[PDB]
């Protein structure tokens, strides 16, 4: 009994929706604090090591940017159908 | 601290930093798993082009992943490569 699949409704949808939304700003935290990491060494060594790093960051950056939106569409579509079972 | 006015950084500082990137590439290796587990739990119930529209942009977000933890990983690691290489100047003479 215990293994039963959980039937599709609006209340899972929005469950499921705020999933992905609350991943979305942990997902922000977490580069803002390693955006935080990596200004806290310019200065604290050689230039060159600190432009290496900084690119490197700015690369994860760029992805985290584009994973962002895409948890957040997936949020929106979840609680579009969702609205659809409701109404 | 160093023999170098130029590092201001001790090896143990550049470790701790490291393991900020290292945790911060688990947790994100552990939500898009968690995600997964949604998208997989639910896909069985979609159908056609909505089941798709639901694979599909999960697999986005999955590209996103594989891009972002290898870029986290290879800044922990490199940290840490540095670290080794300043302690052999730091508290050393």
Request: net charge negative; aromatic share 6%; charged share 25%.
């Amino acid at each position: 009994n215990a293994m039963a699949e959980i039937k599709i409704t609006p209340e899972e949808l929005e469950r499921i929706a705020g999933n992905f939304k609350n991943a979305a700003g942990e997902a922000q935290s977490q580069i803002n604090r390693l955006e935080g990491d990596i200004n806290s060494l310019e200065g604290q060594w050689a230039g060159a090591t600190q432009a290496k790093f900084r690119g490197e960051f700015i690369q994860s950056k760029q992805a985290m940017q584009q994973y962002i939106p895409i948890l957040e569409g997936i949020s929106t579509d979840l609680k579009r159908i969702a609205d659809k079972f409701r109404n």
